[PDB]
Amino acid sequence: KDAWEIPRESLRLEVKLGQGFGEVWMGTWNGTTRVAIKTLQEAQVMKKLRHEKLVQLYAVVSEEPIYIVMEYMSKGCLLDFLKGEMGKYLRLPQLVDMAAQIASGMAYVERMNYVHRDLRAANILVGENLVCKVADFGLARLPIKWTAPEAALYGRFTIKSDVWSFGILLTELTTKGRVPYPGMVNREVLDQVERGYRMPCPPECPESLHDLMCQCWRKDPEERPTFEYLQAFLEDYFTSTEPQYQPGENL
Numbered sequence: 001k002d003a004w005e006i007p008r009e010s011l012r013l014e015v016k017l018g019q020g021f022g023e024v025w026m027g028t029w030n031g032t033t034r035v036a037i038k039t040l041q042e043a044q045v046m047k048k049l050r051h052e053k054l055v056q057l058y059a060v061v062s063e064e065p066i067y068i069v070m071e072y073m074s075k076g077c078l079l080d081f082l083k084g085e086m087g088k089y090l091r092l093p094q095l096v097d098m099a100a101q102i103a104s105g106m107a108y109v110e111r112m113n114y115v116h117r118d119l120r121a122a123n124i125l126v127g128e129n130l131v132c133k134v135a136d137f138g139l140a141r142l143p144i145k146w147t148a149p150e151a152a153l154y155g156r157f158t159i160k161s162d163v164w165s166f167g168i169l170l171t172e173l174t175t176k177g178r179v180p181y182p183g184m185v186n187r188e189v190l191d192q193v194e195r196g197y198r199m200p201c202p203p204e205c206p207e208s209l210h211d212l213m214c215q216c217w218r219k220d221p222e223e224r225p226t227f228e229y230l231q232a233f234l235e236d237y238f239t240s241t242e243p244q245y246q247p248g249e250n251l
């Protein structure tokens with residue numbers, strides 16, 4: 001047992017979040033620390049990754065039943081946030097800033113030579129001040145509406161198939177959380193994307209952002225941009241790219 005190990009007695013499971021691998025609880029730790037607990041690796045893994053825009057591992061419990069203890073994200077998962085009461089007031093500047101934070105977390109993952117494998121809004125967690133962090137490395141190495149064609153078809157998961165999933169996350173953000181390829185079923189999406197079909201410009205989303213999306217969805221993995229490119233572009237967006245941005249009904 002390594003130094004990430006803790007006694008169960010040091011954890012107070014409190015509220016469910018959190019369904020249903022098992023539950024997800026809000027909690028306390030050594031009486032003093034507000035945490036999140038994943039009941040039954042992602043932890044392992046989350047032991048070797050440390051970044052400000054990745055939800056931080058705190059502790060593990062070997063130890064059936066296995067707990068994973070993590071930084072608590074106060075606003076819950078991004079999909080829910082986007083589609084609930086806040087969705088309505090989020091506008092393009094805030095949505096692009098959130099995208100930049102996810103890019104920043106993913107840039108780190110890229111620097112470390114890892115792959116996420118399940119990058120989408122359901123796996124981004126929000127905290128205070130609209131902070132967004134990459135979560136759920138359950139499949140991190142070492143669902144197909146978000147999965148690049150080469151990866152869904154031939155199991156070639158790479159940082160480049162993550163970029164693809166990032167393009168799809170950009171459509172979730174600009175549409176307030178709508179399921180991608182509206183009206184199409186998994187098999188329809190598979191067939192059409194293989195023919196060269198790509199989602200159109202979301203309504204009110206600028207062409208330059210959709211442009212970025214379309215780059216992320218290049219047929220050719222090695223032609224998709226870096227996450228560090230993505231990060232810098234999204235960070236600098238409202239000066240270098242859309243300096244004449246004016247607010248609209250929805251974006």
Ligand SMILES: */C(=C/C(=O)Nc1ccc2ncnc(Nc3cccc(Br)c3)c2c1)CN(C)C
Nearest residue numbers: 036037038068070072073076077079122135136
């Ligand atoms: C939407 C619900 C959701 O993700 N809720 C949620 C709220 C707050 C929170 N804080 C910390 N950690 C988690 N999740 C978590 C993920 C992986 C490991 C551990 Br430990 C905790 C969390 C989750 C999800 N729908 C699928 C959109």
